[PDB]
């Protein structure tokens, strides 16, 4: 018979977890960049 069935090997894996990338610098480096920009502007 011919029916709509999944393939014999099964379908591939499907991701479902939450994925936030965790990008970017730390707080210390961000604050250091801010004070560096301030010091350059003041000079």
């Amino acid at each position: 018979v011919k029916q709509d069935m999944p393939p014999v090997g099964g379908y591939g894996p499907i991701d479902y977890k939450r994925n936030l990338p965790r990008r970017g610098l730390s707080g210390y480096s961000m604050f250091a960049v801010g004070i560096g920009a301030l010091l350059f502007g003041y000079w």
Partner: protein, 176 residues
Amino acid sequence: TYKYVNLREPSMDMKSVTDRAAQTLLWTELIRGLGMTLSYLFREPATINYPFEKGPLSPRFRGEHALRRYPSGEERCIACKLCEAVCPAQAITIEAEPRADGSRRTTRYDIDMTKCIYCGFCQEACPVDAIVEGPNFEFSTETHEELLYNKEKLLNNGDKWEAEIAANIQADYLYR
């Protein structure tokens, strides 16, 4: 078998609390949202060019009603009144009498297109595939009484859309 959403204890050490203070003093997550929207600006929009392009449809689509014919000119309906008995909205009115050659044919077949919920029970209760729901959906009118189809209008619709209705039935009838 259960998970605890929003039961996280944040760290109280100096590094994490300085990261949090930098986040609420320099607006990190607002920049994240801005970056999301800016990245979504440079994607190709999914907008099609109607009416020059049409949305995809399946041959099971239920649109405008039509009355079919046999491939000899004889109309398929034999006035069995199954469609008007199964119609949930009572949109179908059928009156019948024997014609001059003695066949069982209808004399009145009205479908109230303002009552019909477009459910396809009539086309699945028909034993001869006389009434069908065609693929047409661009048939909006300007007057209420134009949406009150009689037998002549449905026969004209069948003669107009047979070349597509027959192909849809041929492609679909093995699933029925």
